[PDB]
Design a protein around this motif. Structure first.
Motif, PDB file in Angstrom:
ATOM      1  N   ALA A  22       1.146  -0.913  -0.677  1.00 28.80           N
ATOM      2  CA  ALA A  22       0.008   0.134   0.113  1.00 28.80           C
ATOM      3  C   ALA A  22       1.300   0.911   0.016  1.00 28.80           C
ATOM      4  O   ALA A  22       0.381   2.930  -0.854  1.00 28.80           O
ATOM      5  CB  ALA A  22      -1.030  -0.076   0.782  1.00 28.80           C
ATOM      6  N   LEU A  23       2.171   1.489   0.818  1.00 38.09           N
ATOM      7  CA  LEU A  23       2.914   2.241   0.784  1.00 38.09           C
ATOM      8  C   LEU A  23       3.331   2.765  -0.041  1.00 38.09           C
ATOM      9  O   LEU A  23       3.477   4.236  -1.039  1.00 38.09           O
ATOM     10  CB  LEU A  23       4.204   2.500   1.812  1.00 38.09           C
ATOM     11  N   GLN A  24       4.191   1.310  -1.411  1.00 37.21           N
ATOM     12  CA  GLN A  24       4.849   1.875  -2.465  1.00 37.21           C
ATOM     13  C   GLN A  24       3.857   2.018  -4.068  1.00 37.21           C
ATOM     14  O   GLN A  24       3.901   2.807  -4.630  1.00 37.21           O
ATOM     15  CB  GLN A  24       5.412   0.286  -3.199  1.00 37.21           C
ATOM     16  N   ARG A  25       2.273   0.654  -3.276  1.00 44.00           N
ATOM     17  CA  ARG A  25       1.756   0.688  -5.079  1.00 44.00           C
ATOM     18  C   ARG A  25      -0.230   1.673  -4.647  1.00 44.00           C
ATOM     19  O   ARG A  25      -0.572   2.043  -5.732  1.00 44.00           O
ATOM     20  CB  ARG A  25       1.372  -0.630  -4.842  1.00 44.00           C
ATOM     21  N   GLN A  26       0.014   1.710  -4.030  1.00 42.50           N
ATOM     22  CA  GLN A  26      -1.577   2.688  -3.252  1.00 42.50           C
ATOM     23  C   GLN A  26      -1.513   3.131  -2.292  1.00 42.50           C
ATOM     24  O   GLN A  26      -2.288   2.982  -0.852  1.00 42.50           O
ATOM     25  CB  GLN A  26      -2.727   1.332  -2.807  1.00 42.50           C
ATOM     26  N   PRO A  27      -0.988   4.421  -2.177  1.00 43.68           N
ATOM     27  CA  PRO A  27      -0.899   5.038  -1.072  1.00 43.68           C
ATOM     28  C   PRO A  27      -1.936   5.566  -0.708  1.00 43.68           C
ATOM     29  O   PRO A  27      -2.915   6.066  -1.822  1.00 43.68           O
ATOM     30  CB  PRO A  27       0.449   6.076  -0.895  1.00 43.68           C
ATOM     31  N   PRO A  28      -2.610   7.235   0.343  1.00 43.42           N
ATOM     32  CA  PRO A  28      -3.232   7.380   0.893  1.00 43.42           C
ATOM     33  C   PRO A  28      -2.730   8.940  -0.294  1.00 43.42           C
ATOM     34  O   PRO A  28      -1.729   9.054  -0.427  1.00 43.42           O
ATOM     35  CB  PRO A  28      -3.278   8.272   2.088  1.00 43.42           C
ATOM     36  N   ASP A  29      -3.822   9.342  -0.734  1.00 48.54           N
ATOM     37  CA  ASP A  29      -3.400  10.176  -1.860  1.00 48.54           C
ATOM     38  C   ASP A  29      -3.029  11.799  -0.770  1.00 48.54           C
ATOM     39  O   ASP A  29      -3.605  11.528   0.597  1.00 48.54           O
ATOM     40  CB  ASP A  29      -4.664  10.875  -2.715  1.00 48.54           C
ATOM     41  N   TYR A 260       5.585  15.928   6.497  1.00 52.83           N
ATOM     42  CA  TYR A 260       4.160  14.878   6.482  1.00 52.83           C
ATOM     43  C   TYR A 260       4.218  13.743   5.071  1.00 52.83           C
ATOM     44  O   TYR A 260       4.660  12.527   4.641  1.00 52.83           O
ATOM     45  CB  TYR A 260       2.654  15.415   6.909  1.00 52.83           C
ATOM     46  N   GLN A 261       4.179  14.068   4.084  1.00 54.36           N
ATOM     47  CA  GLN A 261       3.461  13.072   2.674  1.00 54.36           C
ATOM     48  C   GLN A 261       5.378  13.429   2.268  1.00 54.36           C
ATOM     49  O   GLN A 261       5.466  11.900   1.486  1.00 54.36           O
ATOM     50  CB  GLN A 261       3.162  14.560   1.790  1.00 54.36           C
ATOM     51  N   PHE A 262       6.511  13.636   2.426  1.00 49.36           N
ATOM     52  CA  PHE A 262       7.582  13.535   2.393  1.00 49.36           C
ATOM     53  C   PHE A 262       8.189  12.119   2.767  1.00 49.36           C
ATOM     54  O   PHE A 262       8.882  12.075   2.469  1.00 49.36           O
ATOM     55  CB  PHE A 262       8.122  15.035   2.684  1.00 49.36           C
ATOM     56  N   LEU A 263       7.540  12.098   4.243  1.00 49.74           N
ATOM     57  CA  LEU A 263       8.092  11.205   4.533  1.00 49.74           C
ATOM     58  C   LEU A 263       7.325   9.669   4.409  1.00 49.74           C
ATOM     59  O   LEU A 263       8.420   8.897   4.075  1.00 49.74           O
ATOM     60  CB  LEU A 263       7.467  11.288   6.098  1.00 49.74           C
ATOM     61  N   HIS A 264       6.641   9.719   3.620  1.00 45.05           N
ATOM     62  CA  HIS A 264       5.817   9.038   3.055  1.00 45.05           C
ATOM     63  C   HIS A 264       6.498   8.801   1.265  1.00 45.05           C
ATOM     64  O   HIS A 264       6.690   7.468   1.301  1.00 45.05           O
ATOM     65  CB  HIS A 264       3.702   9.274   2.546  1.00 45.05           C
ATOM     66  N   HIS A 265       6.846   9.682   0.720  1.00 50.93           N
ATOM     67  CA  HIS A 265       7.543   9.740  -0.262  1.00 50.93           C
ATOM     68  C   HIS A 265       8.772   8.635   0.232  1.00 50.93           C
ATOM     69  O   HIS A 265       9.359   8.038  -0.596  1.00 50.93           O
ATOM     70  CB  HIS A 265       8.106  10.657  -1.130  1.00 50.93           C
ATOM     71  N   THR A 266       9.912   9.274   1.401  1.00 50.16           N
ATOM     72  CA  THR A 266      10.777   8.755   1.358  1.00 50.16           C
ATOM     73  C   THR A 266      10.517   6.945   1.915  1.00 50.16           C
ATOM     74  O   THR A 266      11.988   6.424   1.694  1.00 50.16           O
ATOM     75  CB  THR A 266      11.488   9.508   2.942  1.00 50.16           C
ATOM     76  N   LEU A 267      10.188   6.702   3.189  1.00 57.00           N
ATOM     77  CA  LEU A 267       9.526   5.404   3.132  1.00 57.00           C
ATOM     78  C   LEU A 267       9.277   4.764   1.895  1.00 57.00           C
ATOM     79  O   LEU A 267       9.342   3.125   1.766  1.00 57.00           O
ATOM     80  CB  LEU A 267       8.509   5.814   4.256  1.00 57.00           C
ATOM     81  N   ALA A 268       8.580   4.991   0.781  1.00 59.83           N
ATOM     82  CA  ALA A 268       8.543   4.254  -0.377  1.00 59.83           C
ATOM     83  C   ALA A 268       9.955   3.631  -1.673  1.00 59.83           C
ATOM     84  O   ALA A 268       9.558   2.863  -1.374  1.00 59.83           O
ATOM     85  CB  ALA A 268       7.197   4.749  -1.162  1.00 59.83           C
ATOM     86  N   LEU A 269      10.979   4.771  -1.289  1.00 59.26           N
ATOM     87  CA  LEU A 269      11.288   4.800  -1.579  1.00 59.26           C
ATOM     88  C   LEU A 269      12.146   3.957  -0.582  1.00 59.26           C
ATOM     89  O   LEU A 269      13.396   2.865  -1.749  1.00 59.26           O
ATOM     90  CB  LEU A 269      12.709   6.176  -2.033  1.00 59.26           C
ATOM     91  N   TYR A 270      12.754   3.390  -0.304  1.00 55.46           N
ATOM     92  CA  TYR A 270      13.011   2.995   1.079  1.00 55.46           C
ATOM     93  C   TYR A 270      12.908   1.628   1.264  1.00 55.46           C
ATOM     94  O   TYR A 270      13.457   0.117   0.200  1.00 55.46           O
ATOM     95  CB  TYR A 270      13.279   3.482   2.705  1.00 55.46           C
ATOM     96  N   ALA A 271      11.599   1.451   1.227  1.00 56.43           N
ATOM     97  CA  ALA A 271      11.193   0.060   0.219  1.00 56.43           C
ATOM     98  C   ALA A 271      11.384  -0.556  -0.535  1.00 56.43           C
ATOM     99  O   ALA A 271      11.667  -1.777  -0.755  1.00 56.43           O
ATOM    100  CB  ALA A 271       9.217   0.416   0.378  1.00 56.43           C
ATOM    101  N   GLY A 272      11.443   0.331  -1.510  1.00 53.48           N
ATOM    102  CA  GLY A 272      11.856   0.150  -2.642  1.00 53.48           C
ATOM    103  C   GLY A 272      13.335  -0.769  -3.393  1.00 53.48           C
ATOM    104  O   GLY A 272      13.627  -1.203  -4.118  1.00 53.48           O
TER     105      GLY A 272
END
Length: 276
Positions: A22-29, A260-272
């Protein structure tokens, strides 16, 4: 109940666990993330809630104060009083004192800062960009600081410092991050650098993180670090939970909805970037 009890209850019970997928492929808008962010109470302590005579001259900002329950109290190495604008921060899974979030030291608090480093057995400082370290060798109160070696990398400068009191010498690693955003690449390399740092104290102590106020990018760095740890260990992350726990330890951690939004982006990048 009282607005204080409402604040604590929210910070204690809010949560939005997200699977790696969900973080990588279907995140909250972004709209949902902003609204979620704005619901989070700041947990700023008012000056009336601190009974510490003479603290004001040691605060960079009058409204950014250390929460009483988690504040770092100085011993008696110097100057009277136990006050520094710094809080203990819980880490991954609520482990105590993994970080100390503090303001950027003022000229009158540079001795206090190093007293905290010595007292807490800190072996790592992360600065996110008054220089409180020497070009070669300075004396701050009872402490002598000396640069042992220094390497400049494209994204950060690592200083190896020696702190001396008085026939006892300790090594402290200092990372000055000069790539704060735009892009999360450098930030994750900083986290990797932090992870790869060997322990050098007698007992493991907190990592000091600061820039100026100790709540904005300081909060983002610590949320990122904890978030990566959750994703690596569990394959999921609760970012809202992380931010709520940070604000229990220090009022106002993570300042803007963009952070807050950038936190989501950074973790999505880490996950990948996780091992296949």
């Amino acid at each position: 109940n009282t607005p204080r009890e409402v604040t604590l209850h929210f910070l204690r019970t809010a949560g939005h666990p997200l699977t790696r997928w969900a973080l990588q492929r279907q995140p909250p808008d972004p709209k949902q993330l902003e609204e979620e962010f704005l619901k989070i109470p700041s947990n700023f302590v008012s000056p009336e809630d601190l009974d510490i005579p003479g603290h004001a001259s040691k605060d960079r900002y009058k409204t950014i104060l250390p929460n009483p329950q988690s504040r770092v109290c100085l011993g008696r190495a110097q100057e009277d009083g136990d006050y520094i604008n710094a809080n203990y921060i819980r880490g991954y899974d609520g482990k105590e004192k993994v970080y100390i979030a503090t303001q950027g030291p003022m000229p009158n608090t540079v001795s206090d800062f190093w007293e905290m480093v010595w007292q807490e057995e800190v072996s790592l400082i992360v600065m996110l960009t008054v220089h409180y370290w020497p070009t070669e060798e300075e004396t701050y109160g009872p402490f002598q600081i000396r640069i042992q070696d220094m390497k400049e990398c494209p994204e950060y400068t690592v200083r190896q410092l020696t702190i001396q009191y008085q026939e006892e010498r300790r090594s402290v690693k200092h990372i000055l991050f000069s790539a704060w955003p735009e892009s999360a690449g450098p930030l994750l390399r900083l986290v990797a650098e932090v992870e790869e740092s060997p322990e050098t104290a007698a007992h493991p102590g907190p990592i000091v993180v600061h820039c100026s106020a100790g709540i904005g990018r300081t909060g983002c760095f610590i949320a990122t670090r904890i978030g990566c740890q959750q994703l690596k260990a569990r394959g999921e992350v609760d970012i809202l939970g992380i931010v709520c726990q940070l604000r229990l330890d220090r009022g106002g951690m993570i300042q803007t909805a963009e952070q807050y939004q950038f936190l989501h982006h950074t973790l999505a990048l880490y996950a990948g970037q996780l091992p296949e």
